[model samples]
Target: WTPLEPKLITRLADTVRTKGLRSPITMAEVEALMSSPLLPHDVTNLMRVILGPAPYALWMDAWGVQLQTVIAAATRDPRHPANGQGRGERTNLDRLKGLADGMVGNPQGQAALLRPGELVAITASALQAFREVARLAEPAGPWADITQGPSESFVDFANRLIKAVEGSDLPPSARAPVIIDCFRQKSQPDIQQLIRAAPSTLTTPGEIIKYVLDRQKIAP
Candidate 1:
């Protein structure tokens, strides 16, 4: 998160939090977001996406936490999309998509707020973060994995999640450091929600370590 300049980094963070995206993407906000019917498919991913810009304000951006949350809700036949925006035009999915669309390529406005190099490195980090998540994001994994429950072992699920988090479309140099910075913000917590739903799997911890270590290598 430490870029060439302080002011630019601050502004970049602001844009991501306020100006860059459509979703209200904070850890505190995810619970409400999860309540929405349409957003379940991406609720976990969306919550992480909303939290992407600043790690300190948030904490472990691990997919395991989200995936766990997703499974918790799905097991009951609550009847929602694994990645659904929501059902029968009653959801916030379209509004959320609109917000994300509005954020595209507005870096110039952010750049105008600070010195030249200041915004570049920070913005680069932000964009890399966004793209990295998109790249690692699974193609809406088998709904049955949540709906019907996967037959796989917890370690196997852990390994697969790690693979998803590690293989980014972004280069290692860019993906590395930011992830480390994220982990450093806070130790991973035992996400109670996940534990309650998935008593059998401590699935997120290992993958969190891998992504954080892998991201520590991002070149600047």
Candidate 2:
């Protein structure tokens, strides 16, 4: 997809400026704008053209949507403020942080996503939620990179990885293999251990850990 041409946006802004009895921005208008090169402020500002801050925020609450969906949606709009200039290198993280400063920077500051049973929202609070999740998974290093301590046993190491994966946002299905992959490490390639842990039978990461334990009983 392409962004709405800036000329059209400028023209629309001007039209709204002169002729607008300042009709409240409707979902239809916002959707059309979102489909084009809309920005964070456009809704708040355009809404501000007619209504005040509280209503715009209230309107969002009333409609039951995330303000992040709006900002993130706008980011998809090819023409962002960072792009209006030739400067053109603001990454999504950069733009999001910049807008976090811009949108909520003021004392009177303002504003605020998807998935099943999945967390959503684009608020500062949600941003920190992600930061904490990052904190939780700080050992983002792969299995091989994070060695099992000398004292740590194979079952303990494998079990630890399984628990670590449990705390992660990874879907249950994705987690099984990662725990399985722990056996495929370069530092101590227990590829044999993996073969011992039947792939077809071991469904959960926990099951994989147990299968290896059971195999240890046999092979020992």
Candidate 3:
């Protein structure tokens, strides 16, 4: 299965092969982190938190392609909690009272990185809890249905949605164009008109972002 970032997988694979470091993140590290907060803001430790420690990673690897498929499927799970940093939408579950304590929601590209099973979850109930909520992320049915959020800018939007490329059936040439149009069709009530109305000319992501950034200044 295609991964959101094969480069990351490849890198980890390399480390596993060359460095012989299957557990890049260790139990002690995970233990220390549990005491401290790991909000996405703490960019320094965020990745360690998501990748999970050795035992969990190995357990997840047992599923191989299936786990990889879900892990890499890009588009945000619409039901996934959007309100992590007080932005998008709240999770369906009430226990997600806060992101740091419970570590639920965690959508889109970010979800692939999460190792909640071993990194954060301490017991069986919590393991199932993390798995059930994250299971909402894999069904590719709603991917094309995705649209930019009100609070999301093109840059952030690109980061989140670009992960759709991981498992997309489309080829390299066809993919970007589809993504461009996906944005054009539902680019939000404001810029969608301004964009679709023009740049049949837009070709690349950089150009798309440039177009949006420029128009954002002028659009309603």
Please count the clashing residue pairs in each candidate, in the order shown: 16, 0, 0
Candidate 3 global TM-score: 0.36
On residues 97-132, what C-alpha lDDT tens digit does candidate 1 reach at each position?
A: 223343233333322322233222222223334434
lDDT of 3 by residue, 72-94 (tens): 32114433222232224322222
What is the clash tally of candidate 3? 0
User: Which pairs of residues collide in candidate 3?
Assistant: none
Question: What TM-score does model 1 achieve against the real structure?
Answer: 0.22
Ranking by TM-score: 3, 2, 1
Per-candidate TM-scores read 0.22, 0.31, 0.36
Winner by lDDT between candidate 2 and candidate 1: 2
The regions of model 3 sitting more than 4 angstroms off are 1-139, 218-220
Which is the better candidate, 1 or 3, if ranked by lDDT?
Answer: 3
TM-score of 2: 0.31
